[PDB]
Amino acid sequence: KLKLSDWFNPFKRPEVVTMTKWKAPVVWEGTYNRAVLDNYYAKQKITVGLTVFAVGRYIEHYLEEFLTSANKHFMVGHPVIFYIMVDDVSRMPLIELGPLRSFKVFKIKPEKRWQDISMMRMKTIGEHIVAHIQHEVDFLFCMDVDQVFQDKFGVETLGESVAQLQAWWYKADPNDFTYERRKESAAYIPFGEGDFYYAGGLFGGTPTQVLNITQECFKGILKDKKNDIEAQWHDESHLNKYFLLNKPTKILSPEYCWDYHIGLPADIKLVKMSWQT
Ligand SMILES: O=c1ccn([C@@H]2O[C@H](COP(=O)(O)OP(=O)(O)O)[C@@H](O)[C@H]2O)c(=O)[nH]1
Ligand SMILES: [Mn+2]
């Protein structure tokens, strides 16, 4: 019967925002107790999934590095299933997996625009959640293939609904975020409102919750297609709309998804994942 204080120490990081008004922890390096959590979740025999898509040139450029790194840093000490959606299985890189890692590969149709490739994920993930994932995992993360694990990315990140603070905006003012601002779009957020700017290529929660994230995001993607319109940052735009209405029970610091082009500020203590360079 886990308490927040059993594992979370917000005062270890006083220079940053460690909790939200709706009372969700923003998880920053130095704030979490991975050993206590590891013991608690292992006792419950939890299983964590991870979807990743790679279509076209993204297979040779990104997938090996994503999977190789995931194997060594993702939920170590816990059964993890990699869900790999590719258009061409014959180019799939062949990697040795360590203990408590397994996977299964699916063939997908390769969408024509790369914008649709990225946006179809929302449909595809939800179909998989219904078909199998709901039966297989207790928690699930969905991620861009053009990222790499740099260090441990563990059970401290688990919750009902998990969002990623986007690296370029965590410090910024809500009136400056790159939200979709055209009212003609489903992703629309008015000025004056919004809590954080979240990342498109990293989110998670229970299968139940991720089905809701994806279903609502794609409903708004479909609706935008029917008004001759396309959100600024596509699926990330709809994800931000969605998280404004349905607040995430957990937010991850930019340490969990850093862009090195920004440099390295004093805030970013130990990078767990960054963008492939
Ligand atoms: O040709 C493509 C285009 C996109 N993607 C997938 O769609 C995601 C989102 O695209 P991208 O990373 O290019 O978004 P960006 O990070 O540039 O905003 C990628 O991470 C891939 O998983 C892909 O596999 N092949
Ligand atoms: Mn990406």
Tell me the CA–centroid distance for residue 153 and ligand 2, in Å: 18
Which method was used? X-ray
Q: Is 168 annotated among the ligand-binding residues?
A: yes
Residue 236 designated active-site:
yes
202 forms beta bridges with: 143
To test the ligand 1 pocket, which listed residue (51, 52, 53) has its Cβ within 8 A of the most ligand atoms? Answer: 53
Q: How far is the CA of 58 from the centre of ligand 2 (A)?
A: 10
* Torsion, Cα of 53, 58, 64, 69 (10° steps): -60
CA distance 241 to 237: 6
Q: Report which protein residue has its CA nearest ligand 1's atom 17.
A: 146
Q: Measured from the CA of 236, which atom of ligand 1 is nearest? A: 18
User: Ligand 1: which of 106, 112, 114 to mutate, most ligand atoms within 8 Å of CB?
Assistant: 114
What atom in ligand 1 is closest to the CA of residue 233?
A: 18
Return the HEC string of the chain: CCCHHHCECHHHCCCCCCECCCCCEEECCCCECHHHHHHHHHHCCCCEEEEEEECCCHHHHHHHHHHHHHHHHECCCCCEEEEEEECCCCCCCCCCCCCCEEEEEEECCCCCCHHHHHHHHHHHHHHHHHHHHHHHCCEEEEECCCEEECCCECHHHCCCEEEEECCCCCCCCCCCCCCCCCCCCCCCCCCCCCCCCEEEEEEEECHHHHHHHHHHHHHHHHHHHCCCCCCCCHHHHHHHHHHHHCCCCEEECHHHCECHHHCCCCCCCCCCEEECC
Q: Which residues surround ligand 2, an ion (CB under 5 A)?
A: 144, 146, 201
Rounded to the nearest angstrom, the distance between the alpha carbon of 6 and the centre of ligand 1 is 38
Strand-pairing partners, residue 140, are 49, 205
Specify the resolution in Å: 2.7
Picking from 23, 231, 196, 208, the residue whose alpha carbon sits closest to that of residue 118 is 231
CA of 58 to the centre of ligand 1 (A): 7
* Residue of 29, 156, 180, 236 marked catalytic: 236
User: From CA 254, how far away is CA 132, in angstroms rounded?
Assistant: 31
* Amino acid (1-letter code) at residue 118: S
Domains of the chain: 1-277 (3.90.550.10)
Strands across the sheet with 139-143, in order?
26-27, 250-252, 161-165, 198-205, 139-143, 48-54, 80-86, 101-107
